[PDB]
Design an enzyme around this catalytic site. Structure first.
Site, mmCIF file in Angstrom:
data_model
loop_
_atom_site.group_PDB
_atom_site.id
_atom_site.type_symbol
_atom_site.label_atom_id
_atom_site.label_comp_id
_atom_site.label_asym_id
_atom_site.label_seq_id
_atom_site.Cartn_x
_atom_site.Cartn_y
_atom_site.Cartn_z
ATOM 1 N N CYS A 44 0.685 -1.293 0.083
ATOM 2 C CA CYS A 44 0.248 -0.038 0.139
ATOM 3 C C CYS A 44 0.918 1.341 -0.003
ATOM 4 C CB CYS A 44 -1.094 0.055 1.091
ATOM 5 S SG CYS A 44 -2.097 1.451 1.312
ATOM 6 N N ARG A 100 -0.047 4.705 2.862
ATOM 7 C CA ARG A 100 -0.013 4.331 4.313
ATOM 8 C C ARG A 100 0.312 5.436 5.308
ATOM 9 N NH1 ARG A 100 3.871 -0.670 4.706
ATOM 10 N NH2 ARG A 100 4.402 -0.195 2.510
ATOM 11 N N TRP A 145 -9.196 6.250 -0.768
ATOM 12 C CA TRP A 145 -9.620 6.755 -1.771
ATOM 13 C C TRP A 145 -8.666 6.374 -3.126
ATOM 14 C CZ3 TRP A 145 -8.466 9.898 2.591
ATOM 15 C CH2 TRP A 145 -6.992 10.158 2.644
ATOM 16 N N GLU A 159 -4.648 3.739 -11.076
ATOM 17 C CA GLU A 159 -5.595 2.396 -10.779
ATOM 18 C C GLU A 159 -6.722 2.429 -11.916
ATOM 19 O OE1 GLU A 159 -6.240 1.411 -6.453
ATOM 20 O OE2 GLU A 159 -5.878 3.568 -6.270
HETATM 21 C C1 HEM Z 1 -6.672 6.514 1.820
HETATM 22 C C2 HEM Z 1 -5.796 6.599 0.470
HETATM 23 C C3 HEM Z 1 -5.475 5.315 0.085
HETATM 24 C C4 HEM Z 1 -4.535 5.236 -0.926
HETATM 25 C C5 HEM Z 1 -4.289 6.302 -2.044
HETATM 26 C C6 HEM Z 1 -4.196 3.786 -1.152
HETATM 27 C C7 HEM Z 1 -3.381 3.210 -2.364
HETATM 28 C C8 HEM Z 1 -3.211 2.077 -2.708
HETATM 29 C C9 HEM Z 1 -2.912 1.479 -4.067
HETATM 30 C C10 HEM Z 1 -2.494 2.292 -5.188
HETATM 31 C C11 HEM Z 1 -2.821 0.158 -3.961
HETATM 32 C C12 HEM Z 1 -2.413 -0.816 -4.978
HETATM 33 C C13 HEM Z 1 -4.137 -1.479 -5.463
HETATM 34 C C14 HEM Z 1 -3.883 -2.163 -6.672
HETATM 35 O O1 HEM Z 1 -2.988 -1.804 -7.644
HETATM 36 O O2 HEM Z 1 -4.874 -3.136 -6.861
HETATM 37 C C15 HEM Z 1 -3.182 -0.237 -2.602
HETATM 38 C C16 HEM Z 1 -3.408 -1.456 -1.953
HETATM 39 C C17 HEM Z 1 -3.474 -1.826 -0.694
HETATM 40 N N1 HEM Z 1 -4.214 -1.049 0.165
HETATM 41 FE FE1 HEM Z 1 -3.996 0.963 0.201
HETATM 42 N N2 HEM Z 1 -4.759 3.130 -0.317
HETATM 43 C C18 HEM Z 1 -5.342 3.721 0.428
HETATM 44 C C19 HEM Z 1 -6.302 3.262 1.802
HETATM 45 C C20 HEM Z 1 -5.881 2.014 2.319
HETATM 46 C C21 HEM Z 1 -6.804 1.629 3.487
HETATM 47 C C22 HEM Z 1 -7.724 2.672 4.452
HETATM 48 C C23 HEM Z 1 -6.330 0.265 3.755
HETATM 49 C C24 HEM Z 1 -6.622 -0.583 5.046
HETATM 50 C C25 HEM Z 1 -7.523 -0.097 6.106
HETATM 51 C C26 HEM Z 1 -5.607 -0.138 2.692
HETATM 52 C C27 HEM Z 1 -4.587 -1.225 2.485
HETATM 53 C C28 HEM Z 1 -4.298 -1.854 1.503
HETATM 54 C C29 HEM Z 1 -3.974 -3.424 1.096
HETATM 55 C C30 HEM Z 1 -4.281 -4.524 2.298
HETATM 56 C C31 HEM Z 1 -3.610 -3.341 -0.297
HETATM 57 C C32 HEM Z 1 -2.885 -4.633 -1.036
HETATM 58 C C33 HEM Z 1 -4.196 -5.173 -1.471
HETATM 59 C C34 HEM Z 1 -4.200 -6.282 -2.459
HETATM 60 O O3 HEM Z 1 -2.983 -6.958 -1.960
HETATM 61 O O4 HEM Z 1 -4.890 -6.421 -3.348
HETATM 62 N N3 HEM Z 1 -5.340 0.949 1.855
HETATM 63 N N4 HEM Z 1 -3.409 0.768 -1.877
HETATM 64 C C1 H65 Z 2 -8.393 0.689 0.218
HETATM 65 C C2 H65 Z 2 -7.765 1.144 -1.577
HETATM 66 C C3 H65 Z 2 -7.468 2.242 -1.780
HETATM 67 C C4 H65 Z 2 -7.041 2.363 -3.135
HETATM 68 N N1 H65 Z 2 -6.532 3.636 -3.585
HETATM 69 N N2 H65 Z 2 -6.901 1.082 -3.907
HETATM 70 C C5 H65 Z 2 -7.318 -0.065 -3.455
HETATM 71 C C6 H65 Z 2 -7.568 -1.241 -4.448
HETATM 72 C C7 H65 Z 2 -9.033 -1.099 -4.969
HETATM 73 C C8 H65 Z 2 -9.719 -1.849 -5.954
HETATM 74 C C9 H65 Z 2 -10.922 -1.138 -6.334
HETATM 75 N N3 H65 Z 2 -11.591 -1.836 -7.395
HETATM 76 C C10 H65 Z 2 -11.208 -2.924 -8.094
HETATM 77 C C11 H65 Z 2 -9.641 -3.618 -7.793
HETATM 78 C C12 H65 Z 2 -9.072 -4.435 -8.431
HETATM 79 C C13 H65 Z 2 -8.270 -4.041 -9.728
HETATM 80 C C14 H65 Z 2 -7.954 -5.213 -10.331
HETATM 81 N N4 H65 Z 2 -6.994 -5.988 -9.591
HETATM 82 C C15 H65 Z 2 -6.726 -6.747 -10.428
HETATM 83 C C16 H65 Z 2 -7.597 -6.349 -8.275
HETATM 84 C C17 H65 Z 2 -8.260 -5.074 -7.613
HETATM 85 C C18 H65 Z 2 -9.145 -2.826 -6.637
HETATM 86 C C19 H65 Z 2 -7.987 -0.089 -2.187
#
Ligand code: HEM
Ligand code: H65
Ligand code: HEM
Ligand code: H65
Ligand code: H4B
Ligand code: H4B
Ligand code: ZN
Lengths: 411, 407
Positions: free
Chosen positions: B106, B109, B278, B283
């Site tokens: 993430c 963070r 958000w 993405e």
């Molecule tokens: C508030 C603004 C946030 C931003 C800008 C952000 C940004 C991102 C981005 C760009 C990714 C990659 C997602 C993808 O490529 O599919 C990600 C993954 C992730 N985020 Fe954050 N996030 C935010 C909030 C959060 C919150 C609130 C949580 C948990 C309480 C969180 C937990 C995670 C986790 C566990 C992943 C890995 C998910 C996976 O492996 O599919 N994020 N985040």
């Molecule tokens: C908490 C949080 C914040 C953020 N900026 N992005 C994420 C990932 C959000 C998300 C939303 N719709 C769809 C996806 C898919 C897109 C296709 N990927 C292969 C798996 C994740 C991921 C989560």
């Protein structure tokens, strides 16, 4: 044991068995991944098994495994090692070895080309003047008036580590960098330290923005010597843009020949500390990294100003917009001057086919995702979506300490 | 054993000690790095609880206090009696924030301590889950001024009474395979959409149909619920320069909300814990719109721009890519829906990393995921060495319930 990799775009799954043959360590453990870390005197004891492993692979590759010729060669090397503490490779083995080091280079996206490598055997070289001549010839052959040809020149192997051959330049062709008293930099800021060494060694610096550095060459553990590559052998390309006529007035150019000279080639346990090798550029190396890294020529601002992008907030993506145009210009310029270059789309597409071919025929293809994915437009290239396994096979290219930090000065 | 990470752009070196506290395994070995792979009892339970409670009580400067010992004491008795234990509200909130703090993939963070935690452990039915999720969605959306949130449903008991949100994200678009052999809608969601239809969803068969929720309570069979349309905030996509862009008919949803992960705290497992923040622009603009296996719009956009699509070396793909990503950010900003561009986000993350090294001794980070899918090396994270390791509390992947569920 079997390891699977999946391509998340195509759902193609491949099975790796080649990793079973890996010998060196990765840097990672069960508890930590060091996949993004840049950088994570052999006794006869350790040498013969290394020689034996290599020779077994060589003789398998020529379908003579277990032949008398194979057994005689093992015998000959064993006796040479116990007698002289080292051994000499046959020309055939040297060539096979260099090609396989490239084939095994997990950070190289260009490996579809690995079997086409011109190997220049410079093991008879004794002096820095001799090294200079060999390297001039490599530059001329490899450049080939713009129709680039991959080549490697191999200088004598390490003996006691006190007689190393070394090219002190990190690359054969690079531009000088000069630190100004006001803190600004003229030329390539990455090369400031090496430029200073060269000046100290007696190089007369023109102090311009694109000064080709001299070669600093070390033979047989002696102090290094300065040589200027004949300018007529240094092919360069003035950078212009197909639609923007002001782009030429940025005053940019670059050299045609990418040639790494600071790495160590290990073959059968022998160490070749001076082994300059070259191919041709992928556009992004120049257009993204060399020109647009903040720590390099850093031209993003100037370019964006000239395109009149909104530079007040990053969310206008002005940096991204300018980056694309610069990379168009690099490719356009090289193509127009008929100097070999490849774009990141073509190169990564070719890599995927190479990798798949390697899996089928070799049982794997070690690859470092962090290096293979291009520094722009990553996910619109197929390598982004390809799972990869990184491991280390020999023969290999390895990093080695910079010679200025380890050299014992004779004076 | 004490590891250094270097930033090759700035020469700044940080020293990581935090990795020595990692427990879970990476998938890597001394012989092979798997950094690019997407998916690599009372006795079990008490040390996990203890490790967690120790870190909790250390966090409030009460380590080794009687209250620390008393709590530890109380939890152990509860595990011996009931085979499990219940977290105090303070512990649940702490754990959830730290699961996010520990999420190595993430980039966002820096926001970790500002997380609104909704305790839904009192929930018993799928209808209850639906209400809690609607409330989460409405709170987190906040008319476009997004607020990070997580809703936490009851923890796993015997594994036979799991709460699950079957959807991978709370808000996503349906996918339909056509007779034409083409794919309509989001191709990534064809299978899940089929399951919805099998479960009785009347599908609109459009290109941007918000999927219904499929909610599983207490191990029972999942039930279907439609999120109130007025609670799903969407953004029509237009470009500030290209008037024709709106004609593509593109839109996306404002709320990124992950619903398929497992939250582990103190050895306890929360199999239903949807969380949201958000979006970062790429993405949507790079992955959702431009992946070949997703909406795959590169060619259409490039054609409207009249680019030379004969040769790859014209970089027409790269040009269209930038414009698509300009439009996404411009659209969200114009509608006042919170969004962050990849430059701002990665710059924030570097500052966060430095805070974490300075105040915690490290920050586990997965470079492969942290570096944005476009313009990689013009963002600072590209030049930043990162160490990836697994700390608890954590969000974990878990198997999709339709391969698990005894109907
Ligand atoms: C508030 C603004 C946030 C931003 C800008 C952000 C940004 C991102 C981005 C760009 C990714 C990659 C997602 C993808 O490529 O599919 C990600 C993954 C992730 N985020 Fe954050 N996030 C935010 C909030 C959060 C919150 C609130 C949580 C948990 C309480 C969180 C937990 C995670 C986790 C566990 C992943 C890995 C998910 C996976 O492996 O599919 N994020 N985040
Ligand atoms: C908490 C949080 C914040 C953020 N900026 N992005 C994420 C990932 C959000 C998300 C939303 N719709 C769809 C996806 C898919 C897109 C296709 N990927 C292969 C798996 C994740 C991921 C989560
Ligand atoms: C023929 C065309 C070639 C192309 C298009 C190509 C492409 C590339 C690129 C883009 C890189 C990353 C360089 C960087 O980011 O600094 C690289 C690295 C590398 N290449 Fe290739 N290359 C080619 C030829 C060769 C040859 C001929 C050899 C050796 C015989 C070789 C061995 C290596 C090695 C060892 C690395 C890692 C370098 C390092 O770690 O600094 N390549 N290649
Ligand atoms: C054989 C080969 C082929 C190729 N396409 N690129 C390379 C790397 C070329 C290269 C040339 N001058 C300088 C460098 C530097 C740039 C800055 N990097 C941090 C290290 C390498 C790299 C080598
Ligand atoms: C920290 C990180 O490993 C470093 O910036 C790497 C990332 N990937 C790279 N990839 C290539 N091809 N060349 C590089 O120099 C780097 N640098
Ligand atoms: C194979 C590779 O790991 C895969 O394509 C990854 C690369 N990096 C990623 N990074 C993010 N943020 N999200 C992703 O889905 C992926 N996919
Ligand atoms: Zn690893």
């Amino acid at each position: 044991r079997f390891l699977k990799v999946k391509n998340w775009e195509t759902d193609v799954v491949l099975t790796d068995t080649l990793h079973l043959k890996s010998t060196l360590e990765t840097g990672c453990t069960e508890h930590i991944c060091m996949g993004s870390i840049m950088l994570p005197v052999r006794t006869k004891d350790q040498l013969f098994p290394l020689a034996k492993e290599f020779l077994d692979q060589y003789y398998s590759s020529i379908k003579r495994f277990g032949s008398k010729a194979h057994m005689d060669r093992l015998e000959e090397v064993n006796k040479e090692i116990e007698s002289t503490s080292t051994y000499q490779l046959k020309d055939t083995e040297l060539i096979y070895g260099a090609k396989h080091a490239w084939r095994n280079a997990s950070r190289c996206v260009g490996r579809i080309q690995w079997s086409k490598l011109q190997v220049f055997d410079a093991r008879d070289c004794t002096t820095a003047h001799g090294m200079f001549n060999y390297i001039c010839n490599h530059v001329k052959y490899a450049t080939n008036k713009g129709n680039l040809r991959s080549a490697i020149t191999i200088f004598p192997q390490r003996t006691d580590g006190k007689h190393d051959f070394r090219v002190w330049n990190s690359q054969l062709i690079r531009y000088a960098g000069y630190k100004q008293p006001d803190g600004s930099t003229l030329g390539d800021p990455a090369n400031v330290q090496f430029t200073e060494i060269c000046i100290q060694q007696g190089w007369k610096a023109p102090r311009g923005r694109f000064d080709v550095l001299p070669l600093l060459l070390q033979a047989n553990g002696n102090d290094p010597e300065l040589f200027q590559i004949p300018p007529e052998l240094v092919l360069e390309v003035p950078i212009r843009h197909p639609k923007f006529d002001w782009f030429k007035d940025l005053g940019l150019k670059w050299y045609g020949l990418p040639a790494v000279s600071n790495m160590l080639l290990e073959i059968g346990g022998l160490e070749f500390s001076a082994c300059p090798f070259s191919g041709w550029y992928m556009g992004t190396e120049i257009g993204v990294r060399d020109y647009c890294d903040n720590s390099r020529y850093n031209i993003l601002e100037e370019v964006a100003k000239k395109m009149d992008l909104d530079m007040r907030k990053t969310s206008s993506l002005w940096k991204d917009q300018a980056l694309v145009e610069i990379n168009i210009a690099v490719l356009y310029s090289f193509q127009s001057d008929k100097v070999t270059i490849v774009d990141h789309h073509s190169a990564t597409e070719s890599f995927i086919k190479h990798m798949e071919n390697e899996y089928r025929c070799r049982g794997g293809c070690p690859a470092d995702w962090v290096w293979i994915v291009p520094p722009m437009s990553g996910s619109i290239t197929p390598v982004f979506h390809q799972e990869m396994l990184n491991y280390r096979l020999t023969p290999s290219f390895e990093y080695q300490p910079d010679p200025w930090n380890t050299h014992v000065w004779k004076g």
